[PDB]
């Protein structure tokens, strides 16, 4: 009965989520965090980096993907019951573009907790989106119908970036670090960030600059027209909130 389900609750350590606050600049204020997967085990903590290679050869990749998005929606649910309306950015591998079970999970979970889709922001690397355009394009279509926002991370340094934007038409962008580390002193970066910034605004694509660590960079992103910013200098990553 209940007892057997209760005995189950005696849950241990395993995957969990830490969060990085994303701050305002040119954009609209809103509680926005980026979720980072982690693994706790008898005292030690691990970044996916230390275990995604073994996952990669056994292909747990997709399951751990679904687990993450589900925990995201969940966390998104609690924060609502607590009356907050928090938004979460979740990294997602292309392996999830074709996976059907992903859509289904997002749908079920999203309803389970009664959380709107606009609260879930799915980010994927630009490089992976055009190597998988079609599957990436239908994933966008499916997910967007539930109201979820999908965007491109590491966007900006390719020969065909601006043409992906007009084609993929994502909700937001996370500027590549190859453009973001430089801005305080690179003319090429200062112009490119503005080029990207001007093609995004007319459509309302949100711009994000991550891994930010200076005041100068902060100031350069602001002027160039970046909507959001993340990084140690802005806020740490942890369970917090």
């Amino acid at each position: 009965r209940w007892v057997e389900q209760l005995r189950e609750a005696l849950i241990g350590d395993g995957f969990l989520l830490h969060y990085q606050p994303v701050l305002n600049l040119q954009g609209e204020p809103l509680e926005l965090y980026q979720a980072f997967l982690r693994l706790e085990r008898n005292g030690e903590m691990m970044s996916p980096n230390a275990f995604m290679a073994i996952a990669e050869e056994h292909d747990l990749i997709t399951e751990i993907d679904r687990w993450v998005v589900a925990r995201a929606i969940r966390q998104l649910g609690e924060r609502q019951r607590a009356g907050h309306k928090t938004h979460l950015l979740v990294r997602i591998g292309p392996n999830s573009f074709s996976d059907p079970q992903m859509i289904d999970t997002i749908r079920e979970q999203l309803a389970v907790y009664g959380v709107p889709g606009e609260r879930l922001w799915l980010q994927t690397p630009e490089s992976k989106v055009f190597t998988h355009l079609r599957n990436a394009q239908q994933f966008l279509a499916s997910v967007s119908a539930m109201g979820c926002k999908v965007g491109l991370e590491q966007f900006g340094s390719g020969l065909d970036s601006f043409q992906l934007l007009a084609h993929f038409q994502p909700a937001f962008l996370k500027l590549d670090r190859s453009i973001t580390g430089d801005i305080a002193s690179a003319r090429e970066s200062q112009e490119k960030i503005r080029e990207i910034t001007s093609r995004a605004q007319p459509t309302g694509i949100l711009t994000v600059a991550e891994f930010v660590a200076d005041a100068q960079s902060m100031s350069s992103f602001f002027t160039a027209g970046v909507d959001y910013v993340q990084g140690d200098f802005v806020a740490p990553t942890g369970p917090l909130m």
Partner: protein, 97 residues
């Protein structure tokens, strides 16, 4: 405190120290300091070959408390790229023999 130093004396110490199942390769560095995941640190490494110190700018991807095993420390993943392939190669071609 940002700048860490790890000197290994023999293929065995390097074998237990060298983490290979990581991405760009990794090395476990003992420290009783509190490093959090993602930390970008600078490690001066020295392998069993010579006393030359190798520069390694990596990220913390593993933290330990030395609880209830293995000394307490952090696992640093080598910098993505050429400079990573360099330290990772030097190490593999050392433990191999």
């Amino acid at each position: 405190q940002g700048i860490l130093s790890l000197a290994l004396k023999d293929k065995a110490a390097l074998y237990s120290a060298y983490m290979p199942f990581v991405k760009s390769g990794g090395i476990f560095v003992p420290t009783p300091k509190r490093y959090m995941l993602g930390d970008e640190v600078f490690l001066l490494l020295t392998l069993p070959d010579s006393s030359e110190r190798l520069p390694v700018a990596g990220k913390v991807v593993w933290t330990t408390p030395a609880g209830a095993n293995r000394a307490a420390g952090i696992g640093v993943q080598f910098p993505d790229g050429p400079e990573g392939e360099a330290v990772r190669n030097k190490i593999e071609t050392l433990l191999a023999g």
